[PDB]
Design a protein around this ligand. Sequence first.
Ligand code: M58
Length: 164
Amino acid sequence: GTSKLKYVLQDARFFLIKSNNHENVSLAKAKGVWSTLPVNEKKLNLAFRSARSVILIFSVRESGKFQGFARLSSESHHGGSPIHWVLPAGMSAKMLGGVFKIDWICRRELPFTKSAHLTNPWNEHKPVKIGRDGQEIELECGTQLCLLFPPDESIDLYQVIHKM
Ligand SMILES: N[C@H](S)c1cccnc1
């Protein structure tokens, strides 16, 4: 069912994550972590302290889909075991901010064709699929996007609800 999902999404904030490649989303799915540029790191840390749930929705550029979404379980922290991201061409690992711990809520994909009726008021009401890495999605658009995903029956939101 979708009731616990709606509970988790209640009054959440949502951020669009655009990844250069699948390997980074797969690393994120396996390790439960994400690391972003400092400009987005600062926004996520502010948002983490401000709301009951901060949701990251991932899209690999040129894939035509979202690859799932996850909930921030910590602020960014430095000094962990280094994560072997496949960084974009001109980018080095030092340019990255700290590491966020995340809990996955949905590891299934969703094609953009399924979200074409959703527009993000925080990006000029363009379709929610359009946006730079780190673009915030307004509450209602964000919730309806997450509800479009196929249910991920591998996941139990009971532990996530304990985190809030
Ligand atoms: N860690 C991933 S590869 C990433 C790279 C650049 C910006 N944001 C996230």
